[PDB]
Amino acid sequence: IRCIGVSNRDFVEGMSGGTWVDVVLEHGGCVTVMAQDKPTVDIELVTTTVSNMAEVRSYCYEASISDMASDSRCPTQGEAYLDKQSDTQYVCKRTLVDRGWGNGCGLFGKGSLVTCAKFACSKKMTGKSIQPENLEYRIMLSVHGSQHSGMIVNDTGHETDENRAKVEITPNSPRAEATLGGFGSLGLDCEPRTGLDFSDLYYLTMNNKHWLVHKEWFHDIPLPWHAGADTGTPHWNNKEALVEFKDAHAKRQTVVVLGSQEGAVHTALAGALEAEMDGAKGRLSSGHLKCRLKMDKLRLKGVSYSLCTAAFTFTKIPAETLHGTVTVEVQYAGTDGPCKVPAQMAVDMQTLTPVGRLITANPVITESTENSKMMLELDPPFGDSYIVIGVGEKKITHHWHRSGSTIGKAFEATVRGAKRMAVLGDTAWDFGSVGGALNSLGKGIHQIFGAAFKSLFGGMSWFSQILIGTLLMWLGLNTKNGSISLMCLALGGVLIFLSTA
Amino acid sequence: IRCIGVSNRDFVEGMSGGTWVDVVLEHGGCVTVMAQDKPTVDIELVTTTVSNMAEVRSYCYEASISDMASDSRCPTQGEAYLDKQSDTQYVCKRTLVDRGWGNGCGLFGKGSLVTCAKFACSKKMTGKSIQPENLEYRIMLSVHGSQHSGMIVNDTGHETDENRAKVEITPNSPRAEATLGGFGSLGLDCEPRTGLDFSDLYYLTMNNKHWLVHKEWFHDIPLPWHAGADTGTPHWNNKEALVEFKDAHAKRQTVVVLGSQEGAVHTALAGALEAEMDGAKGRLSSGHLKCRLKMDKLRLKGVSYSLCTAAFTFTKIPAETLHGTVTVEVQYAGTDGPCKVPAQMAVDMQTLTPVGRLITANPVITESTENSKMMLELDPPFGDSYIVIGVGEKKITHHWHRSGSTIGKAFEATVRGAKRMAVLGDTAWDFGSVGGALNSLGKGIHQIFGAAFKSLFGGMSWFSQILIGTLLMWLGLNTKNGSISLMCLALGGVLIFLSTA
């Protein structure tokens, strides 16, 4: 329910005695947290808005040379001085050209030439600063329960839904608590400042399009710039990059400027992050977030309820949600009130033993109206199983066959953990961790390797990183020595680091 | 004259019985040809007008996306379709998105999404094709004689100038004859097809800027193009090189056009030539010719004249023309009429012996007025010398010292002809050729290695040429064999091929 259609949902179950579980709540992923006694809730980070942008370098990427002039003197008679050479809104270049009797001079030799061109910028790039005391992460939550199919993307009006809530966790209030009426209150304890390392990033703006440009890339590209937010006629130091001073003949000197390099920088942003701007606040469309989840105040609505009595009905026949879950929606025809649907998985009809785990604890009909739609989600076993719901002989059953194997899921979870460890690195030890001497020492021994990899192999791009991965595969399959394991860890360390993209 | 101020003017000697000499007319250089008993002519190519350019493929370098749409389809329910991918001017890509019960569908899985976007171009690059049967070179000639310094580049009037003449050299009429009244007619026999390999170049056009660009470069840059022969709504083949389709993760595919690539191609030429155009015909500023100078019928003006009486006065001081030569401009005072200036260079003034090559043969004042300005050209020997421009005791003697030496001139002209052989390659063996069994064998051995070097070492923009040169120093110092030369002969031959560029 808001987590059922996403491909990258991960299931985090098992706590430190039931107190808390530590999740790395990503922006494109969704997270389903479940216990044996507690209602499972699907928690998804939806936005990351960066507020209150300060201005740093604002480059000029399409310039225009206005009024010019020049002055030349004969050789061995000094160099030229034009009145707009000590002006800093003009760009100026001196050179030595051939000057002889044909030019007007009276001595053959190299003359002296000065060409001044008024630098006038048309439209400029602007690089805003994104600093960690301005973030306001919206994390939507939604508990599994008395809800139907039209409450998955249905978001218009949620403060009066009792099941779903937004918890805007800013680092100005790094811990929050959501009142899930009836279900208790899910408490979050995020670390919004230790997110995507936002002290080392800016928020570039070009032709009303916005990015998250890395800090090292933004302070080195050679293009005409000024200092801050002075939006008048700036100083534009380093104006030589776009203007071009070639050689003057007796009657030709083209000081043409280079054209609009918006396209030259769209082609240079090969690693940036497409953000969007809704005014002064920047809605980012990416980001991982740390969050410890306290659930000891989150309890089951309707555990005391009596079982259902009569007249189920399959509307919207079951379907498989890309992981092995089977979303079955029912329509309970009956006014016995707040009852509990007895749904399970049965291999043998007249054994009715529960064979498949059920992902949404105590599914409950809530409305006292006659035809109440309601949604489940079931985790069948590998193979064949029936969706036995209702009690007695008026039951409504359904055959399901989920194809797969146990060894296939453990490989699909090794791939899910390797892509999590390639995106996060050290943080991937804090996604299903309840703390310990094994799930928190491995990350401390991994932050050292992560610092000796971000600094050692730097940030090499995809192709050259493959080009040095295959070279370390080949150094692995030779160099016959007692340390045969010498250089075969930056091969899986480089391929899985990007072959899993 | 027309040549006395240029830095790389060359002085050529030696004829096949006086009938002809062979030269390669550099476009930035000038050539002074002198014979035994006939006037020295200054020969310069000044323009190269290319008429009748028929255009080819014409790129777009900044696009604009009009109205958008996108359609999705459930898993295993087909593939999506709009009305607008059946229109050739809209760009469209099919991709897979997650669909579920939240997104209205009925089966969970990867859907199908088609995103159409109306391509509209507003800025164009234009490739014009040029064939050698449309070249229009121009050779301005100007002999040394009755000229004053305000007639060096005074191209205002040459059909009655009696000393200066244009010769239009074209593929249709390559041989030409320049009528110089009194001097006869210098016959030229150029070959304009074997100029600057002009059948493998184009003529770009970008915001009223023109270039010479290699055919192979223009047929390789990946930008949305229509074929150029379409003068309506263009087709724009390969539109997908300016638009970018990105799936965020979910049922959302954005389309964003990349920016104006104008500065990306100003920075991507960097090896092209600049060019203007004065109509439909594009005047170039670079190239050369292969020009035979049929000097046989060029006769000397005013040999039978009387000699000058007296009263020569300087108008301005002699100056040294960067080559050791010194130009001296006198003013004859008197009305004897068309007489001959009696000037020569004196070492040991007491005997008054001529010592240096007086460049301007038959120095003749033609106009009979009282004060007539006149120009001479001198080559003093290496050292102290005197410039006598008269007869009797009223002669003019100017002390001249030329700073230099004989072995310094021989190494400056060995490097000067090695830069000339590096710029031209094959043709620089026919810059002063008289037709020999060695100057035409050294040419065949240089054209063979030049074709076995331009095909072996392809395009390398100086930096890789130095990298591979320095790379061949260590491989010419090792691998003891007879081919340690063959890796060191193409060591100096490649880095110095790039040094003086």
Partner: antibody, heavy 127, light 110 residues
């Protein structure tokens, strides 16, 4: 850029007559000058140019050697004197500034042509 | 030639392009750049295009210049109800060493 002429007069052919003009703000020594004539009922006709020093000083082939243009650097003022002056040369006069310096006039003087004028005052040479 | 003839008067409908064709010779136009000038009804002239295709600051972008051989075609596009003024060509000829003006080009809006 603020330039104004002065020195009109009505004089019969063959005596002295002068005009003058000046400006400020920018530098006057490192710029050139040129005096322009404009007969009513006609367009404009050029008169003379002065370099940034005065050595190079060129007059048009209409009234060569007959009008004398005078100024130099350290005065910030332009003059124009005329004596033994032709009869129907009466016209408005203009003090425009060719935006260059004319150390050479046609070689490395790419950007010639004058920026900003002022509405001057004409003279009258008639009976 | 030092006369520099060019058409006296031109009448073009508004919002279309107007050409001014100058045919000098290689004395002035055919070797170095050409200038072009704007003299107001009452006020004094100003320059419009120096170096034959450039625009000084302070003038509308309606104008544009060109210089092909001895064909100087100047272009005022989108003629409106204000430029009822005269237009002048000018170039330096270096042999006769003069700054030759033009004859005159008046346009009327209609």
């Amino acid at each position: 850029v603020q330039l104004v002429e002065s020195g009109g007069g009505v004089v019969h052919p063959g005596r002295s007559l002068r005009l003058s003009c000046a400006a400020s703000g920018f530098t006057f020594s490192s710029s050139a000058m040129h005096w322009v004539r404009q007969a009513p009922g006609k367009g404009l006709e050029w008169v003379a140019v002065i370099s940034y020093d005065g050595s190079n000083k060129y007059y048009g082939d209409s009234v060569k050697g007959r009008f004398t243009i005078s100024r130099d650097n350290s005065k910030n003022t332009l003059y124009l004197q005329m004596h033994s002056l032709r009869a129907e040369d009466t016209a408005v006069y203009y003090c425009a500034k060719d935006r260059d310096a004319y150390n050479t006039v046609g070689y490395f003087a790419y950007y010639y042509g004058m920026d900003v004028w002022g509405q001057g005052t004409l003279v009258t040479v008639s009976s | 030639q030092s006369v520099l003839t060019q058409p006296p008067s031109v009448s073009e409908a508004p919002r279309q392009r107007v050409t001014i064709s100058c045919s000098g010779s290689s004395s002035n136009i055919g070797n170095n750049a050409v200038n072009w000038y704007q003299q107001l009804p009452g006020k004094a002239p100003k320059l419009l295009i120096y170096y034959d295709d450039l625009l000084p600051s302070g003038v509308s972008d309606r104008f544009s210049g060109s210089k092909s051989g001895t064909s100087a075609s100047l272009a005022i596009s989108g003629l409106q109800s204000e430029d009822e003024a005269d237009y002048y060509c000018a170039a330096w000829d270096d042999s006769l060493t003069r700054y030759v003006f033009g004859t005159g080009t008046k346009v009327t809006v209609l």
